[PDB]
Structures are given as structure tokens and as C-alpha cells.
Design brief:
72% of the residues lie in helices and 0% in strands. The chain has seven helices and no strands. The two termini are 23 Å apart. This is Bcl-2-like protein 1. Belongs to the Bcl-2 family. GO terms for molecular function: BH3 domain binding; channel activity; identical protein binding; protein kinase binding.
Length: 143
């Protein structure tokens, strides 16, 4: 969870930055990572401009505090956690990183990654573990 989730977060954000033409330099595991990269693409394919509201409600800057990030992300989980919402959470972080690079605030990329790992470990792992762990995630989204 600790380092594990951190690595998962960094992998997803690096993937998204790479995929969209940006640098990722400011930074069964292999199976979890692949299932998550793919799940995110699927989500973004069928949910365009998904987080306009949220990112807009956040408009991150180098002075933004974790609490503001936490408060906004909590919105995705108004009705609790589920796999689709966890995938949205990853896509949202990816969108925030892209937005940060576009605003010439690449310094926020590693910060967003830390915030995501903290949020994942604190609010999401409880549910994930109760529902099969990442193995169940791979089982549902893998291949």
C-alpha cells in the first residue's frame, strides 16, 4: 500500500503524460498497472471532459493545500467507493497533472502524485481491501 500505491500512482500519471505528449520526467504489480492504464483509457473514451467541474472547482496552484484536493476528490465518492469511481479518481489526477503542465506549473506533478497516494492509502484502500484487493481489480478489468 505505502510504496505500492505510490508506484501505482506514479505509473498511471506517467502513462497519461506520455500518452498525451508531455514529459513524465518530474518523477502482480505489472498486471495491476496495465489493467489500470487500460481502465483509465476506457473511462476517458466514454466520459469526455469528465472533470471540468471538479478541476475547475480546484484550479490548482503551488499554494493549494492537500485539504482542498481532498475536499474536491471526496465529491467523486459522495455515494461511497466502487471500482469505476477509483478509476475516475486516477483519471482525475492525470487530468490535473496535464492541466498543471499546461499552466507551466510542472512542479505540481510530483505534488499531485503524493496527494493521490495519501488519498488512496487513507480513503480508498479500506474499501479496496474489503473487496478483494487489487487482484479483484485485475480480475474485473484485466486482459
Amino acid at each position: 500500500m505505502s510504496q505500492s500505491n505510490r508506484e501505482l500512482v506514479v505509473d498511471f500519471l506517467s502513462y497519461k503524460l506520455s500518452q498525451k505528449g508531455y514529459s513524465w520526467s518530474q518523477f502482480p504489480m505489472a498486471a495491476v498497472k496495465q489493467a489500470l492504464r487500460e481502465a483509465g483509457d476506457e473511462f476517458e473514451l466514454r466520459y469526455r471532459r469528465a472533470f471540468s467541474d471538479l478541476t475547475s472547482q480546484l484550479h490548482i496552484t503551488p499554494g493549494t493545500a492537500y485539504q482542498s484536493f481532498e475536499q474536491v476528490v471526496n465529491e467523486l465518492f459522495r455515494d461511497g467507493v466502487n471500482w469505476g469511481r477509483i478509476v475516475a479518481f486516477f483519471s482525475l489526477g492525470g487530468a490535473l497533472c496535464v492541466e498543471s503542465v499546461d499552466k507551466e506549473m510542472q512542479v505540481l506533478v510530483s505534488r499531485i502524485a503524493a496527494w493521490m497516494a495519501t488519498y488512496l492509502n487513507d480513503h480508498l484502500e479500506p474499501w479496496i481491501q474489503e473487496n478483494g484487493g487489487w487482484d479483484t481489480f485485475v480480475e474485473l478489468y484485466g486482459n
